[PDB]
Design a protein around this ligand. Sequence first.
Ligand code: BNJ
Length: 125
Amino acid sequence: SMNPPPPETSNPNKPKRQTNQLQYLLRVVLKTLWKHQFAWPFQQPVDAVKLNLPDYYKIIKTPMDMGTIKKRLENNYYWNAQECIQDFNTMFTNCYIYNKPGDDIVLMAEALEKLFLQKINELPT
Ligand SMILES: O=c1[nH]c(-c2cccc(S(=O)(=O)NC3CCCC3)c2)cs1
């Protein structure tokens, strides 16, 4: 298939954790970013069949999206906030990698990344 399986949202071999920072990342950061006018392309894994992007997964080897991140947070999949933040950063970077400077989708990622950074600048203790 053109589409690989989506990234795991559970892994019984991996330990779970809940922290105040992870709770914040779900309740405030993700759930607020989700409502942004530019969030829609990033709310689910890229579907290469739907979007007619047969090269997407030929180029992007560590796919990530906010749907996956949300499920991971809901599952307590992450050990800590930094692990979650790394997934957001992978999502943004993938967008810059797959596309070109100035592309509409890149302008969307750039705006979301700024909002994301604003929100994670300060996390709860
Ligand atoms: O690099 C990435 N592109 C996307 C994406 C997902 C759904 C739609 C779009 S888009 O802005 O509507 N571009 C269309 C995608 C195929 C041709 C145009 C981008 C998520 S991550």
